């Protein structure tokens, strides 16, 4: 199960806001948080607005939690399962597609990474193949750089830790964007989580 | 100016690659002859020195000290008068890999006017003094705003100077059965206002002199709201508003919070040197952003391209695997070669770090050596 936390706050106890992206969540029943296997039990759920007890994917959640460190909680952690949860980063290869630049990128370029709620600083280490728009054909040798409007697969380091999943797996935890300044300099899609 | 940038690289290099030298017994003389001094004199004191290390009573030590005193005097004869800026010499012999040696003999002028005297033989050379030739620094300004008092000053290289400061008395003293909280603001809310006015006033007086700014920095430091109050004022603008490099929230103020405004500021100033380096990769990158592209990269392309119709700007990164066929750790520093005759190949060269987001990339992703060529370039 998956809940990307957008907001944090101490109101009537600890509270968290997000969208329930996967797996139904029951009133009270344990969760565990990311990327810190951090224990936590539900105290109350407000889907859309009113309260619910059971709440399934799609609903806008506002949960009162009960846990170990309760403002030590950052916008960008999923709520996951006890139990079979949720892989996490810092390293991955991914298909990128270099929209409003419009200058260059070569390896060692930096930018900000929007994936789910996470919004971490990040750098592209090296760039692998430059994927053509012809027949989806991958490249052959690594380019030094990647121009605007181009496409490629590249390796990326998060500052610290992301809670990550591959697009080709759970894509809500996948489709990401390299935002630099204002301009959304590029569009990313996570392929290979290393390791 | 670009020919002295190189100078500093040249010195920087030496300076470090002399720490890497460390030979045995006392056979490592450092000599720094300040200008306006007189060789024959120095060289005389070296006979006075040969004269006493003529005993030494340590065989292997002795034969070496002498051999290094000659070694220096010998190089001192290639000068008949102390060069306008001073003479720097370094003589000895140093152990390396495998246990081979290397009679090391350095003697140059100085990209400046060296000033200081020093004759010393440790088992290493002494460049603690050559590093003063690298403080080639800009003058920075500081405004330090405070609940009462403001203080203007500069920090240039290593000289903090206090320039001007006045202290105010914003009727902070209250009443007990007569004054108004209307009295607070009325006169307080304009004092504070009328006060930032004199700050911006004495800022424009002290930093922009004659059409333009005579600093190059401006760090603003102040108690709550005093810089977002000065920064954002219809009375403090012009160049200054666009010259501020860092802010500092301080609880202090005056010479107290002016020191703190430096300790806290160090971080960003160390960037000016960085700027013109970021500026100069920009043009390079932004050839390759383009179809036209008088750009080159690697060893191969850069070399012959430098060899013929010049490249206007040659960009190499301070450190470099490559040597002079051009081998790295695969078995003269190539950059060093560029330094000692880049000028005859088609004008200036710019040496750049791997410490800015472009530096990072130039070295990370191009080879740390390339050029913004002068015209078209027919590839293989
Ligand atoms: N102890 C000293 N410290 C600094 N400068 C000195 C000293 N003694 C003499 N000088 C003189 O000051 C000049 C260098 O110091 P100054 O602070 O003027 O550097 P500068 O302003 O960058 O000028 P330049 O680039 O010519 O050195 C030299 O020409 C030298 O004659």
């Amino acid at each position: 199960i998956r809940l990307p936390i957008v907001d944090k706050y101490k109101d009537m106890g600890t509270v968290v806001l997000g969208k329930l992206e996967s797996g139904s969540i029951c009133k009270g029943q344990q969760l565990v948080m990311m990327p810190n296997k951090h224990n936590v039990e539900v105290l109350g759920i407000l889907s859309d607005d009113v309260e619910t007890d059971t709440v399934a994917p799609g609903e806008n959640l506002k949960i009162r939690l009960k846990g170990i460190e309760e403002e030590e909680i950052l916008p960008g952690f999923i709520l996951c399962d006890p139990n079979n949860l949720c892989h996490s980063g810092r390293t991955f290869d991914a298909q990128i597609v270099i929209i409003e630049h419009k200058s260059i990128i070569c390896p060692g370029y930096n930018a900000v990474l929007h994936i789910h709620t996470c919004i971490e600083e990040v750098e592209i280490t090296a760039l692998i193949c430059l994927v053509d728009k012809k027949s989806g054909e991958k490249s052959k040798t690594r380019p030094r750089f990647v121009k605007q409007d181009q496409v490629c697969i590249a390796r990326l380091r998060t500052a610290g830790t992301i809670c990550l999943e591959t697009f080709k797996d759970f894509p809500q935890m996948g489709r990401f964007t390299l935002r630099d300044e204002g301009k959304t300099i590029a569009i990313g899609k996570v392929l290979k989580l290393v390791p | 100016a670009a020919d002295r940038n190189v100078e500093i690289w040249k010195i920087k290099k030496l300076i470090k690659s002399l720490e890497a030298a460390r030979g045995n017994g006392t056979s490592m003389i450092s000599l720094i002859i300040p200008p306006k001094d007189q060789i024959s004199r120095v060289a005389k004191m070296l006979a006075d020195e040969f004269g006493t290390a003529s005993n030494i009573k340590s065989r292997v030590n002795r034969l070496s000290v002498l051999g290094a005193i000659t070694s220096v005097q010998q190089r001192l004869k290639l000068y008949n008068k102390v060069p306008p800026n001073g003479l720097v010499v370094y003589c000895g012999t140093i152990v390396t890999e495998e246990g081979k040696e290397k009679k090391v003999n350095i003697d140059f002028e100085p990209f400046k006017p060296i000033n200081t005297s020093l004759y010393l033989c440790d088992n290493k050379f002494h460049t603690e003094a050559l590093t003063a030739l690298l403080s080639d620094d800009s003058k920075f300004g500081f405004i330090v705003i405070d609940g009462s008092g403001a203080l203007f000053g500069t920090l240039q290289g290593n000289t903090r100077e206090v320039l001007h400061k006045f202290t105010v008395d914003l009727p902070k003293k209250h009443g007990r059965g007569g004054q108004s909280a209307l009295r607070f603001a009325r006169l307080r809310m304009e004092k504070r206002h009328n006060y930032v006015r004199k700050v911006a006033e004495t800022a424009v007086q002290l930093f922009i002199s004659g059409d333009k700014v005579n600093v190059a920095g401006l760090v603003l430091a102040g108690s709550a709201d005093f810089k977002t109050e000065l920064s954002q004022s219809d009375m403090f603008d012009q160049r200054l508003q666009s010259k501020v490099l860092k802010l500092v929230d301080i609880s202090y103020g005056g010479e107290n919070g002016f020191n703190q405004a430096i300790e806290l500021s160090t971080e960003v100033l160390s960037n000016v040197k960085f700027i013109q380096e970021k500026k100069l990769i920009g043009r390079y990158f932004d050839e390759i952003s383009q179809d036209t592209g008088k750009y080159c990269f690697g060893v191969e392309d850069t070399l012959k391209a430098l060899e013929m119709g010049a490249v206007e700007i040659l960009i190499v990164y301070e450190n470099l695997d490559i040597m002079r066929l051009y081998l790295t750790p695969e078995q003269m520093p190539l950059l060093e070669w560029f330094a000692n005759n880049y000028k005859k190949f088609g004008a200036t060269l710019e040496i750049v770090t791997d410490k800015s987001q472009e530096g990072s990339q130039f070295v990370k992703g191009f080879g740390g050596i390339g050029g913004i060529l002068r015209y078209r370039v027919d590839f293989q």
Side-chain angles (χ1 to χ4, degrees):
Chain A
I1 98 127
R2 254 99 266 193
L3 178 88
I5 296 172
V6 194
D7 228 14
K8 182 199 105 58
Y9 71 53
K10 205 291 292 176
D11 163 59
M12 227 80 81
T14 274
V15 183
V16 168
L17 298 90
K19 204 181 214 231
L20 213 211
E21 296 291 337
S22 166
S24 37
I25 162 154
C26 294
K27 175 173 179 69
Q29 283 223 51
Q30 297 286 79
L31 312 121
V32 150
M33 212 177 53
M34 222 73 200
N36 14 292
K37 281 98 71 51
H38 205 258
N39 296 346
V40 76
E41 160 208 324
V42 180
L43 294 180
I45 308 168
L46 294 85
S47 155
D48 216 48
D49 208 27
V50 183
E51 61 87 278
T52 37
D53 315 320
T54 68
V55 63
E59 283 162 298
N60 258 10
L61 263 33
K62 308 140 200 205
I63 348 266
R64 201 199 272 196
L65 266 62
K66 207 274 275 199
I68 310 292
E69 247 66 42
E70 300 314 301
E71 76 266 341
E72 254 208 2
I73 172 158
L74 267 85
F77 297 158
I78 39 186
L79 294 183
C80 302
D81 218 65
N83 192 42
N84 313 358
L85 42 93
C86 291
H87 303 294
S88 44
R90 76 288 161 185
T91 319
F92 61 90
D93 308 315
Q95 199 221 26
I96 302 190
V97 57
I98 284 302
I99 36 181
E100 331 160 301
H101 235 299
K102 295 171 174 190
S103 54
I104 307 248
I105 278 168
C106 74
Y109 180 89
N110 301 73
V112 194
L113 176 57
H114 310 231
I115 326 170
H116 32 96
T117 47
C118 53
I119 173 48
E120 177 103 314
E121 169 87 45
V122 78
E123 164 195 328
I124 55 199
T125 48
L127 24 65
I128 323 294
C129 277
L130 200 141
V131 37
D132 193 350
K133 281 99 157 212
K134 94 145 193 164
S135 229
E137 253 278 330
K138 275 159 39 226
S139 171
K140 287 129 207 310
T141 65
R142 299 199 297 281
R144 308 278 195 284
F145 72 99
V146 65
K147 210 130 83 110
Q148 204 183 341
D149 286 7
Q150 250 162 42
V151 201
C152 66
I153 33 187
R155 198 181 303 260
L156 281 70
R157 266 269 283 275
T158 160
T161 309
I162 285 295
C163 35
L164 226 209
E165 284 313 323
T166 79
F167 189 82
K168 231 206 83 169
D169 223 80
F170 291 151
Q172 76 290 353
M173 304 249 323
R175 206 171 143 255
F176 70 81
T177 147
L178 279 340
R179 194 95 44 111
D180 175 353
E181 263 91 20
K183 231 92 137 42
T184 306
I185 213 147
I187 285 208
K189 226 179 77 182
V190 42
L191 284 144
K192 200 168 199 154
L193 204 169
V194 219
Chain B
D3 274 37
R4 200 141 138 269
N5 296 337
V6 167
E7 286 312 344
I8 297 184
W9 146 252
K10 222 170 278 210
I11 303 272
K12 264 213 273 283
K13 179 76 189 187
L14 201 85
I15 286 187
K16 202 301 217 71
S17 43
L18 282 182
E19 330 287 48
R22 226 173 123 214
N24 308 79
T26 51
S27 198
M28 295 278 276
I29 342 212
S30 315
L31 188 49
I32 267 148
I33 320 187
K36 88 193 158 175
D37 188 21
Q38 281 203 355
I39 281 177
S40 78
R41 180 206 83 82
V42 177
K44 209 281 188 203
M45 161 254 289
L46 293 206
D48 276 293
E49 265 294 280
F50 194 98
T52 50
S54 218
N55 200 275
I56 260 277
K57 225 311 198 80
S58 185
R59 223 309 189 104
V60 153
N61 206 317
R62 199 215 310 121
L63 182 71
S64 234
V65 193
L66 304 165
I69 286 192
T70 294
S71 208
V72 46
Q73 253 167 204
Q74 282 304 139
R75 297 218 59 74
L76 222 53
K77 296 198 174 213
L78 278 132
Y79 291 77
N80 30 31
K81 169 55 89 177
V82 185
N85 303 276
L87 229 223
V88 181
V89 213
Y90 286 119
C91 273
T93 316
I94 46 94
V95 30
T96 189
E97 193 212 352
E98 308 172 85
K100 289 288 187 190
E101 297 178 355
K102 206 92 175 317
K103 293 159 193 163
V104 43
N105 290 106
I106 305 90
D107 53 307
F108 55 106
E109 194 137 348
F111 91 91
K112 222 353 236 171
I114 203 21
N115 63 348
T116 160
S117 186
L118 176 196
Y119 166 75
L120 226 208
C121 350
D122 221 13
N123 44 46
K124 64 161 195 262
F125 308 120
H126 291 285
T127 52
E128 298 101 8
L130 266 185
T131 41
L133 246 200
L134 316 184
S135 213
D136 214 309
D137 276 295
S138 322
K139 217 220 319 273
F140 281 65
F142 279 83
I143 301 177
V144 198
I145 318 286
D146 185 349
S148 77
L151 178 139
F152 313 81
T154 57
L155 184 272
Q156 174 195 0
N158 226 301
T159 327
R160 3 154 269 134
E161 168 175 35
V162 219
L163 263 167
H164 194 101
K165 54 157 175 180
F166 48 102
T167 184
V168 295
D169 228 2
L170 329 168
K172 344 153 208 305
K173 191 257 161 204
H174 296 95
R176 258 197 145 274
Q179 85 137 243
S180 201
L182 175 71
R183 188 259 168 267
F184 159 62
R186 232 292 64 73
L187 204 165
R188 195 96 190 268
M189 267 290 270
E190 190 161 336
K191 262 264 166 52
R192 194 182 186 181
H193 207 339
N194 257 50
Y195 163 79
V196 186
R197 165 186 286 177
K198 206 205 152 193
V199 167
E201 179 89 280
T202 323
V204 170
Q205 243 81 336
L206 268 298
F207 292 123
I208 161 176
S209 309
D211 309 13
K212 234 92 148 62
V213 280
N214 60 39
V215 277
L218 265 293
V219 176
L220 323 174
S223 44
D225 303 34
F226 271 133
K227 32 188 176 328
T228 293
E229 199 140 303
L230 170 69
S231 196
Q232 181 78 7
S233 119
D234 258 38
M235 232 147 284
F236 168 63
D237 52 287
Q238 295 138 165
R239 315 78 180 160
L240 303 171
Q241 182 192 102
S242 301
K243 300 282 166 203
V244 188
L245 263 34
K246 183 183 266 280
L247 293 164
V248 190
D249 292 347
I250 40 165
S251 295
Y252 287 1
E255 291 179 19
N256 213 18
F258 164 41
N259 261 334
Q260 203 172 207
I262 307 170
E263 289 167 345
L264 271 302
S265 84
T266 289
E267 200 71 3
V268 147
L269 292 58
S270 346
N271 288 328
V272 185
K273 23 278 191 41
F274 274 132
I275 275 163
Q276 304 275 49
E277 154 152 336
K278 296 187 91 177
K279 214 167 194 193
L280 191 131
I281 282 196
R283 177 142 13 95
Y284 178 96
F285 261 153
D286 294 41
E287 285 279 358
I288 332 172
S289 300
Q290 317 297 1
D291 282 8
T292 53
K294 313 82 176 280
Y295 77 93
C296 73
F297 66 145
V299 288
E300 222 95 337
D301 291 354
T302 310
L303 280 154
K304 191 95 92 185
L306 188 64
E307 276 184 21
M308 58 172 298
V311 332
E312 185 216 316
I313 286 181
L314 165 63
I315 314 187
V316 180
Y317 145 77
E318 33 197 21
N319 308 280
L320 214 93
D321 253 33
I322 328 145
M323 215 88 54
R324 189 163 187 279
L325 277 148
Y326 303 72
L327 39 141
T328 65
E330 36 200 313
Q331 46 277 345
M332 175 184 297
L334 212 215
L335 178 46
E336 160 166 323
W337 194 72
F338 297 145
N340 268 2
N341 57 358
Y342 63 91
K343 273 294 302 297
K344 291 294 190 263
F345 259 150
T348 62
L349 133 83
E350 273 264 345
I351 301 90
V352 290
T353 74
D354 64 344
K355 319 253 291 296
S356 51
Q357 202 206 332
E358 298 92 356
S360 170
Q361 296 180 69
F362 192 55
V363 203
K364 267 294 127 208
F366 278 124
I369 167 162
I372 312 176
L373 311 161
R374 293 202 292 187
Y375 48 88
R376 50 223 83 200
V377 50
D378 200 309
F379 301 126
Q380 264 221 284

